[PDB]
UniProtKB/Swiss-Prot annotation:
The protein's name in its UniProt record: Type-3 ice-structuring protein HPLC 12
Keywords: Antifreeze protein, Secreted
Site (Important for ice-binding): 10, 15, 19, 45
Tissues expressing this chain: Detected in blood serum (at protein level).
Native source species: Zoarces americanus (Ocean pout)
InterPro entries: AFP_Neu5c_C (IPR006190), AFP_Neu5c_C_sf (IPR036732), Antifreeze_III (IPR006013)
GO cellular component: extracellular region
AFP-like domain: residues covered: 5-64
């Protein structure tokens, strides 16, 4: 396990536009969106509430493809 994923550094309400303070990088399982894509995610919207500490998955971000 060396691949880190993006996880929620705070509760992100449904339909929020993602900012950099909201995302940390952490080695978690299952693996979600790669931590190196945190720059690609700023200004995109999530389509559900993401509690603090939850791994961000591809299907949670509106318009994400990678």
């Amino acid at each position: 396990m060396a691949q880190a994923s993006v996880v929620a550094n705070q509760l992100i309400p449904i339909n929020t536009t993602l900012t950099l303070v909201m995302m940390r990088s952490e080695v978690v399982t299952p693996v979600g969106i790669p931590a190196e894509d945190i720059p690609r995610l700023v200004s995109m919207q999530v389509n559900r509430a993401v509690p603090l500490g939850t791994t961000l998955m591809p299907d949670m971000v509106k318009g994400y493809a990678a």
